[PDB]
Amino acid sequence: QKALKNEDVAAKFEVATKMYDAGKYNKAIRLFEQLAPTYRGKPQAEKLFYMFSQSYYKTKQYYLAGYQFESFVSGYPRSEKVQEAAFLGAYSYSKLAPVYSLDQADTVKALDKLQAFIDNYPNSEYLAQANESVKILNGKLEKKAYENAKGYNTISDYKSALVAFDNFIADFPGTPLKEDALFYKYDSAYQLAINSVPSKMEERLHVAQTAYANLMKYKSDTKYKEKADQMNARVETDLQKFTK
Amino acid sequence: ISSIDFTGNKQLSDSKLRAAMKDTKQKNVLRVFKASKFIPEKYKTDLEKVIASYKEKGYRDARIIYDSVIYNKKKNMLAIKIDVEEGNKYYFGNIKFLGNTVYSDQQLNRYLGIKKGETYNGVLLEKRIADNTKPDGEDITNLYQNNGYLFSKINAVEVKTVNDTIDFEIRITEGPIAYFNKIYVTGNDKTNDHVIYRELRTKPGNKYSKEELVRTIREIGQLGFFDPESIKPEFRNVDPAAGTVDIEYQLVEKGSSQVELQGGYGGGGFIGTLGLSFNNFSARKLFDKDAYKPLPMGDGQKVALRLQGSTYFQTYSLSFSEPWFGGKKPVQFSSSISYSKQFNYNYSSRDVNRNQSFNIFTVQVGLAKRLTVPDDYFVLSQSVSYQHYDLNNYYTGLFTFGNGASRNLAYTIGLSRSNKGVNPIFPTYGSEFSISAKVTPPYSLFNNINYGDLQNQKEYKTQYTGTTTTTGIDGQAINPGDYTKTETVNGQSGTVSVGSDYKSADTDVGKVDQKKYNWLEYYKVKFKADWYTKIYGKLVLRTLTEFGFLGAYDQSRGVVPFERFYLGGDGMANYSMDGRETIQLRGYPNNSLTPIIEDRNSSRYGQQIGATIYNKFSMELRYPITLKSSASIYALTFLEAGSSYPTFKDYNPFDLNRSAGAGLRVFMPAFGLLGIDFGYGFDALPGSTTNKANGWETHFIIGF
C-alpha cells in the first residue's frame, strides 16, 4: 500500500512480486492495474503481465484471466512458457460456461479456443486435460438438446417430442444419451397411440411398434426393459383387436 | 394565400379537391389560416395526394399539367394555378384466378371483395392482394401463408384494357407446403430454457402459420422476462424441396425487479399499497452461493413483498407464485403470508380511535387451473386459508369479546370465464363471469354443543371472579365467586349478588359470543358479471351486475361478525388488506354506505357492523377519445345503484342508493392506469341528521 501512493516503478514491481509469492493476489491485482499500461515494454515485462494473469486465475476472476492470458500469448510470441499461457487462457475461458439450461454462447467460444489450442501445439502435458474439457463442454451441448426434446414429453406434446427426438438421434450421432432418447421417444409414441381417436389408432400403434423395435435392437438389455415390455404388450393387445 | 386557380375540374368538385391536400392550404378565417405558406416538399407531396384522390375516385388517366405560383408584388400572397386532365371512368372486370388448387375460385372471389362494375382503385387491389400496413389483415397473401404455404408468390397483372374496363388476372404460384422442423431459442442468459419452450405456439411437426408466430411473439413479450421489442424470429435452413423451416427466437432479457403503487385518494385517504416484486425467482437454488446474486434467478416464479396501508391499517405481505406446478399442466400455485394491524374507524365521520385495535395473521395456499374444453376461457381457482384475529379493546359494532380471538379456516372455489375481446384495455364485446364460494367446515353438525341454550348454563352467567367483597347496589357486599345480576335503581346502575340462584342471573354476552365465534362457521357466495356490448361506432356500454351472500349453517350460532360486505367508495381495497369486501360505488366516500346500528338507546349508534346481502347494478357508457398506442386516454360515464343489508330477514332490494357521474381514464406504458372520476350521490349516508345528499367526490385512482 506504500507503493500505491509512491511512484517508484522498481519498488512497485518488487512489492508486487513479494505479494504474489506470499499469495496476496488480490492486492497484486490492484498494483498491476496501477502498472498495467505504465510498465509495458519496460524490462521484467515477461514476469510482468504473467503473474498479473495467474493472480487472476487463482483469485477466480476467470474472464480477466482469459483476457490477460490471451494478451500475453498474442504478445511475447517467443516466450519460454507460451504453451502454458495458451492452455491456461483456454481453460480459464472454458470454466465460464453456463449451465445447460441457459444460452451456451460461451460454450461454443470455449470449444473454439480449446480446439485452437489442440490444433496448434498438438503435443503437451496439457493435451489430456484440454480434451477432457472439450468432452464435458460437448456433453453440456448435448444435454441441452436432450432436455429441450424431453420438455415435450413432460408438457404432454407427444408428437412434438416425436419429431424433436428424431432430430437428436441423428444430429448427435455418438452420445451416451441415445438410449434415453430412444426410450422417451417410444414413450411418446405409445402415449399418443393409446389415447387416440378410433380412426387414427392403427397408424400410431405401428409408429410405436417401430420405436419399440428400435429400442430393443440398439440395446437388448435396456435399462427400461420391464416398462418397455409392458407397454409393448399393451400395444399388441390393442392392435390385435383391430386386425381384420 | 389565395392559391386555388384550378383550371379543369369537370367532375372532382373544388371543395373536396382542396380538402385532398393536407398541408399547403389557402387564406381563410381558420386558426391563423391553417399556417398557410410555402413549403416545397409539403407542396409536392400535397400534389401527389391530389393525384391520389383523383385515382381513388376512379381516374387513372388523371394528371397535373400546369402548376404555377405567382407572388403578388402589391398585396403579398401566392396564387397557385393547377391544371388537371381528368380522363375516363374505369370499371373492374373479369378478375380471374390462375394457379389455384388449394382454394376454389369462388372462395378467392369472395375473399377479394371485388365485383363486376366497381370503379377502378389500384390501391384497393394492392391492399387486398398484399396488406403492407397491417400484418394481421385478411388479405390473400395472408390466407396463403397462414396454412403453411410460405413459398407462395401472387402477382397481379393486366391482360386486356377495352371499353374503359380492365381485365385482371392473378398469377398464383403455390409451391411445397411448409413444416416446422427445428424451433429453438437463443439469448436467454438468466432465464432457463424450459420456461420459454412451454409457452410457445410454434411446435415441431405442425404446419407453418404466421398468425401462430405473431401470437407466440406476443406471448413471449407478455411473459414479463423479455423486452417486447427484442423478440425477433429468424427463418433458418429454409429448404424448398423437403418443406422444412427452422425458426430461431432471438431474445434479450429486460429485468426482474418492479415496484407497484396501486391505490387511490378520494377524500378518505391513501388506501394504497407498495410492492417490491421479483418475477424471475427460483426456489430450488435458494442455497446456491453463486446463483444468489440479486436473490436467485431462473424459473418464472414470482415473489413479492408488499406493504398496504391507510390512515387506519398497516398490512405486510409476502407472496410466492409458480405459473406451472409439477411441470406438466398450467396449474398456477400461489402462497401468501400476511400480518395486518387495524384500528377502529367510522367511515361516515372520519375518526381514528387508536386504543381499539385488532390484528390479522393470514396464510393462504391456492391452485388455479385453466380447465380444458367445456369451452375455453375458463379458470377454476381453489384455495385454503387460515386466519387469526387477535382483538385489543375492540368494543365496536356487533363485537362483544373485545379482548379475545377468533380463528378462520376456509376453502374457496371459484369459476371465471373471460371472453373480453379484442383490445385488452378497451373491450368491444365479450363477457366476464365470476362465481366464487367460500365454505368453512360445518362444526355445528359434529360437536355436541347446543348454541340456542348456551346462555342458560352456569358457566356463562356473570360468575364474578372478583375476590373483593366491597359493596353492592342492594346494600349487600358481593360475596366473591358468586353469581350476580345488574339491577339499576333510581338513576344509577349496579349489581346484586344472588348466591346459588344462577337460573335468575345475567348472561355474559361476551363469553357466549366468544364461544359462538371461537371458530368461525359460515358460507359466502360472490357473483360478478360484465356484459360488454356494442352500440353506435364509439359508444361502449358496460354492465357490472353483482351479488353477494353470507350465512351460517346453524341459525342459532348466527352470522359471523367477520368477513362481511361493505358498500361505498372506490374499489381499490381488497380482502388482502382487511377482512372486508369493499363494494364499489363512486358517488359516496369510501365504505360509507355500510349499515349501522340504528338503535338510538344503544350506547353505540354510528358504528358500522357490516352487510351480509348486497346487490349492485352499474351501467357505463364509454367513448374511446384518444385510443392509441403508448397512451389510451378515454372517457366514461356512470349510472350505478347499490343496496346492502346486514340481515336477509326484511331485505328490500328496491332502495338502491343511486350515484351518477363521469370521468376519464389515462393509461401509460409504465405509469399504469391512472384516473380521475367525479360523482354525485343521490341518497343520504346512513345515520345522518339531515337528509340532503353527498356531494361531488374526487376519486383519484392509481392502478409506478
Tab-separated table of C-alpha atoms in Angstrom, chain A residues 98-103 144 147-148 151-152 154-157 159-160 163-164 167 171, chain B residues 181-183 185-193 197-198 203-206 324 327-328:
chain	number	residue	atom	x	y	z
A	98	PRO	CA	-23.153	-21.616	-18.088
A	99	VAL	CA	-25.430	-24.471	-17.034
A	100	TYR	CA	-27.129	-26.471	-19.783
A	101	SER	CA	-30.423	-24.582	-19.391
A	102	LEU	CA	-29.076	-21.156	-20.405
A	103	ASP	CA	-27.566	-19.737	-23.598
A	144	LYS	CA	-29.261	-29.009	-23.732
A	147	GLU	CA	-33.639	-31.743	-22.308
A	148	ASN	CA	-35.314	-29.492	-24.884
A	151	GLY	CA	-39.538	-30.954	-22.484
A	152	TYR	CA	-42.281	-32.025	-24.868
A	154	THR	CA	-43.449	-33.663	-19.994
A	155	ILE	CA	-45.895	-30.918	-21.040
A	156	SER	CA	-47.790	-33.597	-22.999
A	157	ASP	CA	-46.993	-32.541	-26.575
A	159	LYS	CA	-45.979	-35.540	-31.489
A	160	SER	CA	-43.621	-32.594	-30.996
A	163	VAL	CA	-40.266	-35.054	-34.139
A	164	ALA	CA	-37.842	-33.368	-31.733
A	167	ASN	CA	-33.520	-34.869	-34.960
A	171	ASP	CA	-27.747	-34.717	-35.023
B	181	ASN	CA	-38.640	-28.997	-38.037
B	182	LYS	CA	-36.324	-27.225	-35.589
B	183	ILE	CA	-37.510	-24.438	-33.286
B	185	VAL	CA	-34.441	-20.025	-28.582
B	186	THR	CA	-31.173	-18.094	-28.282
B	187	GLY	CA	-30.284	-15.239	-25.945
B	188	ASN	CA	-31.531	-16.400	-22.516
B	189	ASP	CA	-28.702	-15.523	-20.128
B	190	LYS	CA	-30.654	-15.767	-16.853
B	191	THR	CA	-33.984	-17.466	-17.700
B	192	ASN	CA	-33.997	-21.240	-18.042
B	193	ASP	CA	-34.795	-22.960	-21.319
B	197	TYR	CA	-40.262	-23.584	-24.564
B	198	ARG	CA	-43.537	-24.458	-22.809
B	203	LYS	CA	-44.219	-26.639	-32.323
B	204	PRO	CA	-42.275	-29.136	-34.458
B	205	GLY	CA	-44.426	-31.223	-36.772
B	206	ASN	CA	-47.054	-28.512	-37.229
B	324	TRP	CA	-46.559	-24.120	-13.757
B	327	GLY	CA	-44.025	-29.128	-14.850
B	328	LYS	CA	-46.831	-30.782	-16.826
